[PDB]
A paper describes a structure:
To characterize the structure that is stabilized by ATPγS in reconstituted human MCM recruitment onto nucleosome-capped ARS1 DNA, we analysed the reaction by cryo-EM. As in yOCCM, the ATPase domain of MCM is oriented towards the C-terminal face of a hexameric ORC1–5–CDC6 ring. The C-terminal winged-helix (WH) domains of MCM3, MCM6 and MCM7 contact the ORC5–ORC4, ORC1–CDC6 and CDC6–ORC2 interfaces, respectively. Conversely, similar to yOCCM, the human ORC–CDC6 and MCM rings are aligned so that duplex DNA can traverse the entire length of the complex. Although the cryo-EM density is of sufficient quality to only build 39 bp, we note that OCCM central channel is 185 Å long, which is enough to protect the approximately 50 bp measured with benzonase footprinting. Inside the channel, ORC2, ORC4 and CDC6 contact both DNA strands, and MCM4, MCM6 and MCM2 track along the leading strand via PS1 pore loops arranged in a staircase configuration. ORC6 is absent in the hOCCM structure, which is not surprising given that omitting ORC6 has no effect on OCCM formation in ATPγS according to DNA footprinting, and 2D averages obtained in these conditions appear indistinguishable from reactions in which ORC6 is included. Two tandem WH domains of CDT1 interdigitate between the MCM6–MCM2 and MCM4–MCM6 α-helical bundle (A) domains. The two WH domains of CDT1 are bridged by an α-helical element that packs against the WH domain of MCM6, connecting the N- and C-terminal tiers of the MCM ring along its outer surface. The MCM2–MCM5 ATPase gate is cracked, yet topologically closed, with a recognizable α-helix from MCM5 packed against the MCM2 ATPase domain, keeping the subunit interface sealed.
Numbering used by the authors:
A (entry chain 8): 456 to 544
B (entry chain 4): 191 to 355, 369 to 397, 414 to 423, 439 to 535, 544 to 669, 680 to 721, 729 to 771
C (entry chain 6): 20 to 38, 42 to 101, 110 to 172, 194 to 252, 294 to 305, 327 to 604, 613 to 665, 713 to 736, ...
Write the structure that this text describes.
């Protein structure tokens, strides 16, 4: 679900890559659940480690920036995430 | 070449802005630097063209939001605001200043969108030199005077008017809203007269290695603290404990954020109260502190509402207390002040914040200041009594809020009068100038932290102190004093010596 | 615009193919109704159906909106205005810049002023006065019979308090509502508006279309369920809500109860009974008078904080100010009406003038504020819970004077607080040691010295879930309350019917805390103590292995009640009964042997020291001293 929101965020910002701070702040301000920024950061790290092809992270200077492929089909990605969750069970 | 790495970093991030240091241009080419100073408005387009061509040559597949713009900064002309002359018109200038007010977002047209009234033929006109080149004929039906301007379709740029402490600054596009009132900024921009300054760049370490080595050498002296006590206020005699307390207040404590705990930001800054007969060293000491300490404030015994003549909106002005944020505020004749102001003072003393709810205006302000107050006993003479209220008549709340209270009594001892008269008739330099930067370095660099031994010592001190009567606020003040002494020794850990010295000073003040 | 025609065709496609029933067919058929002329379309359905169209609409909303209206008209005519909802992104008022003009965004704010409904001429049929030529369908750039008019409303909105950066003046924004959006918003409400930022001659104005005010995830729901079944939920919540505060747990219980709050009731006579709780804390300095205010402010998002003297009468309830442009008089909101359905905290309540407290009087009890000033007549809701902090006269509780002489407050103000706690500071070595170690541990070990049973967000979710239940009062609770109030009232702070209503509210709050649909007498017994205690120490001293005074009284009460009930026993039998009754708490052998030790010691101590138990001749008979009540 959060991933979906993330997509919309990158749809809204007209930008190819965004910083951790701004993206996490916007996701928290738009998420259905009240969460801490650290939890959002760990969730983003988990998304990067599970699904690197869709979502990429780049270490620049003293920050890490987030880039995503907007042309990917959301349904197939959701199916892959469900399969991964089933496997982890 | 750092500029190729800068261009690569811009490529990675996609932000089309170049920051160029003017000293680098001066070193590389003095004539080019002179041309930049004389005619910035003509060399900036050339710089933009050159950097754009280089970047497109290196990486031609760049999808840039805007063309790369060059922002020179830190010109040699660091002229004072009062040194402006009619000679430097249309030249680059750099001014350091304080920001007072910032205007709202002002949209300015940069592309006029015109549409034919018959066939809906659309055209765009670039805005140039404050005049609109409105088309008179149609591009399809050739009908004269059939053009209509659409404000919504037109392109707008954000511009902001800012008052700098005064001069008027005009921030455009990206530079807009990057500066908050109450901050110190170095503004680099072109001077223009209609007078105003158009901003090009904003600017928001200070010690060489030899200075740090000298500071370490001085700190390795075990006597430096006492020597620094001798350094403070040379004209003041036999007030060594007062000088020690002033130095500890100058060092202050360390700031801690308790956001994870759910607690409010605890005060970490020291306040000292002085009480005695008038004509003593109170006023001179207050003047000395105000002059020595940067951002210091002197007041005698808050925010207010001002009507904006332009938008008829009620804006807020900051009093001396807010203006002295992160500084030291000193007050004379504390006793002679109105009770309403002293009632207000409780919040700033305790929570370091200030809340106003008046005439529908609700606001909260940060007030990180240290209060150094001087008071006069009500009898104008030290009547033999027991409690300080019996001589000064102050409420228990204000007295409990003070970290340190000192009393200036002129003793009836003849030798003291001899020494005072000799000091007067006979009425160091290496210390205070170094000490300003030393205090700045200590504030910026080091922060102490508490230990287990000091924990046990403080617990024992508290349980012993309560037998004399004791509030947890004096325990907090003792922690702050220990932190200040640890900063004095430039020690990253609070040890037994700091706690023992703080307890000694507190007990000496209580005994007196 | 070719892209506009493409957008119109794609919107027709979405209207005609979205689904196993097409959601919008019934809405389009109802659009024929004259009172219905705007269509509400979800943004999520638009984006899932196709992404290019969704992005184009989000980016060129002003460009394609008339084409969307044309598509709607064509679709309806085959068998009008378009409204959008559920945009996933929220934005701040300070974020509104010129770069966002024409973008479909939704903004959150609070309505402060309203203006009456006006007709706006959209397309006008003009008659030339020279040649009598009728010019029809003339759009307006910002014959009445043949022209088209649309209802209009103007709204003035202000920044929310939470989004307001410190030291910043909350900016105001103008909002234009048309057609069904008119009169859908009321002054003093917080709303999210979906629309665009248009350019008025320049000037910044927002055109809006819509207004804003079981399905929870499985794991959050299960966590809430599990924590709802905790037997020690009350104490765990009390400890977790104030992890860094030592002792004074009665204040913690009171503030938790006022956070839960009771239920409001309106009589058939139209009179509303307050379903909230007001709390007063008065104490000598150096206590935790303030810290509770800060904790409740940071925890509850609907909390407002204020100081005593700095607040005027106008700033608390409301003020009447003349509007510059309209040349009339309007109302500027006060703190109390901004704290609606929240909690308002006042610090240093004593320093406030009587002229301010008399203004507070009405909002205290009647829960509403009435203004009859300068030709302006109005009534406003003030549904707030007030938490007041104060110190006694001269800052120290002087025991040489009476209790009444130690509080400089008016009688009705004293009466209208449900809970009134007075804190007295005493010099005890064990309390000093505990306070010192807690403070130093917090100063040295900031994060590792915090053990929270439940997360703050979890507490917030549980409180939100619990506040919507409305428990019923049982007959047993009814007669228990009757007899308890009998006993209490048969004995300065006089106890009137207001205290009875407070007791009912407290029982309802206890019922809501435990997620019980009915009220039980145990809640009444719990609240009776809290209402009784009044003056309270920081911590009770230990009693000789040590045991607290409250537990000692509890054990004594239990044993006396059991013996007195059996009167209408043996030592071993009574101990066996006690261990049978306390089996719900013991979880280990060590706890059982500890409980046996404790009960043996307590029975011996009562037998030989307090004389409440008398021995009668290895298993001696025990009887109750006939003068214990
Ligand atoms: N039980 C306690 N646990 C932890 N800290 C405490 C406790 N009691 C007092 N303190 C400390 O003492 C301080 C005094 O609390 P405050 O509520 O700010 O003062 P106060 O009692 O309200 O007096 P006023 O009204 O500000 S003049 C707190 O901020 C804590 O640091
Ligand atoms: Mg307080
Ligand atoms: Zn034409």
């Amino acid at each position: 679900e959060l991933a979906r929101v993330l997509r919309s965020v990158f749809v809204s910002e007209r930008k190819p890559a965004l910083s951790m701070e701004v993206a996490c702040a916007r996701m928290v301000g738009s998420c259905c659940t009240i969460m801490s920024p650290g939890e959002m950061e760990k969730h983003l790290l988990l998304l990067s480690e599970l699904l690197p092809d869709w979502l990429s992270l780049h270490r620049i200077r003293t920050d890490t920036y987030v880039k995503l492929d907007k042309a990917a089909d959301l349904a197939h990605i959701t199916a892959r995430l469900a399969h991964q969750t089933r496997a982890e069970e | 070449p750092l500029y190729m790495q800068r261009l690569g970093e811009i490529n990675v991030i996609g932000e089309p802005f170049l920051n160029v240091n003017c000293e680098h241009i001066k070193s590389f080419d003095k004539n080019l630097y002179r041309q930049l100073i004389s005619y910035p408005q003509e060399v900036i387009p050339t710089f933009d063209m050159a950097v754009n061509e280089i970047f497109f040559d290196r990486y031609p597949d760049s999808i840039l939001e805007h063309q790369i713009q060059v922002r020179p900064f830190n010109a040699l002309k660091t002229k004072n605001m009062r040194n402006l002359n009619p000679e430097d018109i249309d030249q680059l200038i750099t001014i350091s200043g304080m920001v007072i007010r910032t205007s709202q977002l002002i949209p300015e047209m940069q592309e006029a969108f015109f549409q034919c009234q018959v066939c809906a033929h659309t055209t765009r006109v670039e805005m140039d030199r404050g005049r609109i080149a409105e088309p008179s004929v149609c591009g399809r039906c050739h009908t004269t005077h059939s053009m209509a301007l659409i404000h919504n379709r037109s392109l707008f740029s954000d511009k902001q008017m800012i008052k700098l402490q005064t001069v008027i600054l005009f921030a455009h596009n990206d530079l807009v809203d990057k500066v908050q009132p109450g901050d110190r900024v170095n503004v680099t921009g072109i001077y223009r007269a209609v007078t105003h300054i158009d901003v090009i760049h904003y600017r928001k370490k200070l010690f060489s290695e030899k200075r740090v080595e000298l500071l370490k050498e001085l700190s390795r002296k075990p006597d430096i603290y006492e020597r620094l006590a001798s350094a403070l206020a040379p004209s003041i005699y036999e007030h060594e404990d007062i000088k020690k307390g002033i130095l500890l207040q100058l060092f202050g404590g360390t700031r801690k954020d308790f956001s994870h705990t759910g607690r409010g930001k605890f005060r970490a800054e020291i306040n000292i109260l002085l009480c005695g007969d008038p004509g003593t060293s109170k006023s001179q000491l207050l003047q000395y502190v105000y002059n020595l300490v940067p951002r210091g404030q002197y007041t005698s015994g808050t925010a207010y509402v001002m009507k904006d003549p332009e938008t008829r909106q009620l804006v807020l002005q900051t009093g001396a207390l807010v203006l002295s944020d992160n500084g030291i505020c000193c007050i004379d004749e504390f006793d002679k002040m109105n009770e309403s102001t002293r009632s207000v003072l409780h919040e700033v003393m305790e929570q370091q914040t200030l809340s106003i709810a008046k005439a529908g205006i609700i606001c909260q302000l940060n007030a990180r200041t240290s209060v150094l107050a001087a008071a006069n006993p009500i009898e104008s003479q030290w009547n033999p009594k027991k409690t300080t209220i019996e001589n000064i008549q102050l409420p228990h709340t204000l007295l409990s809020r003070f970290d340190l209270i000192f009393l200036m009594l002129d003793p009836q001892d003849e030798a003291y009068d001899r020494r005072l008269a000799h000091h007067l008739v006979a009425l160091e330099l290496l210390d205070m100038a170094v000490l300003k930067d030393y205090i700045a370095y200590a504030h910026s660099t080091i922060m102490p932290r508490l230990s287990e031994e000091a924990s046990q010592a403080l617990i024992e001190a508290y349980v012993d102190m309560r037998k004399i009567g004791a509030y947890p606020r004096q325990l907090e003040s003792l922690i702050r004093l220990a932190e200040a002494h640890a900063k004095v020794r430039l020690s990253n850990k609070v040890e037994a010596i700091d706690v023992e010295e703080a307890k000694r000073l507190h007990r000496e003040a209580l005994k007196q | 615009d070719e892209v506009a025609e493409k957008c119109q065709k794609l919107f027709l496609d979405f209207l005609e193919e979205f689904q196993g029933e097409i959601k919008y067919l019934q809405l389009a058929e109802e659009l024929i109704r004259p009172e219905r002329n705007t269509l509400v379309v979800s943004f999520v359905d638009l984006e899932q159906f196709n992404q290019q169209l969704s992005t184009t609409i989000q980016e060129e909303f002003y460009r394609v909106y008339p084409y969307l209206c044309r598509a709607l008209k064509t679709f309806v005519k085959d068998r009008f205005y378009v409204a959008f909802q559920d945009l996933p992104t929220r934005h701040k008022i300070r974020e509104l810049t010129s770069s966002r003009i024409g973008l479909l965004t939704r903004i959150s704010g609070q309505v402060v002023r309203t203006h009456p409904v006006h007709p706006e001429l959209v397309s006008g049929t003009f008659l030339c006065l020279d040649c009598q030529t009728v010019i029809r369908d003339v759009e307006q750039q910002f014959d009445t019979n043949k022209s088209r008019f649309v209802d209009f409303q103007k709204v003035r909105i202000q920044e929310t308090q939470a989004e307001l950066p410190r030291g910043s003046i909350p900016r105001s924004l103008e909002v234009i509502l048309r057609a069904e959006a008119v009169e859908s918003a009321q002054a003093g409400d917080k709303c999210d508006f979906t629309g665009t930022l248009i350019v008025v001659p320049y000037r910044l104005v927002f055109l809006a279309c819509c207004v804003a005010p079981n399905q929870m995830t499985v794991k959050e729901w299960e966590k809430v369920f599990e924590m709802s079944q905790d037997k020690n939920l009350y104490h765990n919540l009390c400890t977790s809500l104030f992890p860094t505060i030592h002792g004074n747990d009665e204040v913690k219980r009171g503030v938790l109860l006022m956070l839960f709050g009771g239920v409001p009731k309106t009589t058939g006579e139209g009179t509303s009974l307050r379903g909230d709780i007001n709390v007063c804390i008065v104490g000598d300095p150096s206590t935790a008078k303030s810290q509770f205010l800060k904790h409740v402010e940071e925890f509850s998002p609907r909390a407002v904080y204020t100081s005593g003297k700095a607040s005027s009468a106008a700033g608390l309830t409301a003020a009447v100010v003349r509007d510059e442009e309209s040349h009339e008089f309007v109302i500027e909101a006060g703190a109390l009406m901004l704290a609606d359905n929240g909690v308002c905290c006042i610090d240093e309540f004593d320093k406030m003038d009587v002229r301010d407290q008399v203004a507070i009087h009405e909002a205290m009890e009647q829960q509403t504020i009435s203004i009859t000033k300068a030709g302006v007549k109005a009534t406003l809701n003030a549904r707030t819970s007030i938490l007041a902090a104060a110190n006694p006269i001269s800052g120290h509780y002087d025991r040489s004077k009476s209790l009444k002489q130690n509080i400089n407050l008016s009688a009705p103000i004293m009466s209208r607080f449900d809970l009134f706690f007075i804190l007295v500071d005493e010099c005890n070595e064990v309390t000093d040691y505990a306070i010192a170690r807690r403070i130093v541990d917090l100063h040295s070990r900031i994060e590792e010295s915090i053990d929270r049973v439940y997360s703050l967000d979890d507490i917030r979710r549980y409180l939100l879930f619990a506040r919507q239940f409305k428990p019923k009062i049982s007959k047993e609770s009814e007669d228990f309350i009757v007899e308890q109030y009998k006993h209490l009232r048969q004995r300065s702070w006089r106890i009137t019917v207001r205290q009875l209503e407070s007791m009912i509210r407290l029982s309802e709050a206890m019922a809501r805390m435990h997620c019980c649909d009915e009220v039980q007498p145990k809640h009444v017994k719990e609240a009776f103590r809290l209402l009784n205690k009044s003056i309270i120490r920081v911590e009770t001293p230990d009693v000789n292995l040590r045991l607290g005074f409250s537990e000692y009284c509890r054990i004594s009460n239990l044993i006396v009640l059991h013996l007195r009930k059996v009167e209408e026993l043996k030592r071993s039998e009574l101990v066996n009964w006690y261990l049978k009754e306390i089996e719900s708490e013991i979880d280990s052998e060590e706890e059982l042997i500890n409980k046996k030790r404790i009960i043996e010691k307590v029975i011996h101590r009562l037998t030989h020291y307090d004389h409440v138990l008398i021995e009668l001749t290895e298993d001696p008979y025990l009887v109750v001293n006939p003068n214990y009540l």
